[PDB]
Design a protein around this ligand. Structure first.
Ligand SMILES: [Cs+]
Ligand code: NA
Ligand code: NA
Lengths: 91, 91, 91, 91
């Protein structure tokens, strides 16, 4: 479950990294950063796609990727960190 | 369900696209982009409504549209992509 | 329920409107706009508090107000718009 | 529960405050502010990490910290403010 969500999240971010570095001309690290803050809804106060292709892709990217990213964040906290933390709580 | 949420989401975005292009003078694609990043809470680091009418509308738009947009994103991931993905998981 | 959440949300936004217009010197409408986009997590790409008092207040404001605002948005969509929409669905 | 989530949230914010003030050179209050708006997804329309180290850390920080911060916000509203409010509702 967590493994699959992990892989799915990685593939989604790779796609965004490739798209923004190609179409919007961002350095790969910047394309990855933008992809991450966009899908987690944090957003960036500096960059917004400048091309119409970038704007359309971003719209579709958000709708398709938000659900996945938060499902992963969910399991990552309830199925990976909760126990690890809740474990020590045990005297 | 997904069909209705889809239509409802589309109508909400059309309303925002018309409003921002008219009152804030944005190009239609930019008005649609702003509407999408606003209702998904991603936000935009470049544009913020410049008119008081735009500010008031945006406030009301957020409160009324956020619930709908995320309900659609929810079903879109749990009722449309989960199975499609979870399907292959089956050897 | 919805009435109480409505009132509670209104009071929270009034407090933010008063604070930002006073300490950060924003026009009341701008203070209200900032309060709304902050608590809904949309954010603003133009304004960020400039004073340390404003930064500290915003931090506390977010933690205390986010829960309330989304609880209201929740009921507003499930207890006020869902039925109104789901009603017509009935032939 | 709320106590543990409180402590965990505090430690996470301390780590972000130390990181951004050191690597990105922000004043401690600004580093804390950025950490808070990033993990709550509000975001900042003015600052974005300028270093690659800052960008990578932020990506990891978001994925690991978002789950915790919202779990705390959740309990803080349902286990700390709901009753306090719901109490008076009682004639
Ligand atoms: Cs945001
Ligand atoms: Na958000
Ligand atoms: Na934002």
């Amino acid at each position: 479950e967590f493994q699959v969500l992990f892989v799915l999240t990685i593939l989604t971010l790779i796609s965004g990294t490739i798209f923004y570095s190609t179409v919007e001309g961002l350095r790969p690290i910047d394309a990855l950063y933008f992809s991450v803050v966009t899908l987690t809804t944090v957003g960036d106060g500096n960059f917004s796609p400048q091309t119409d292709f970038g704007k359309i892709f971003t719209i579709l990217y958000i709708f398709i990727g938000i659900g996945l990213v938060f499902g992963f964040i969910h399991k990552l906290a309830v199925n990976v960190q909760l126990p690890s933390i809740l474990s020590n709580l045990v005297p």
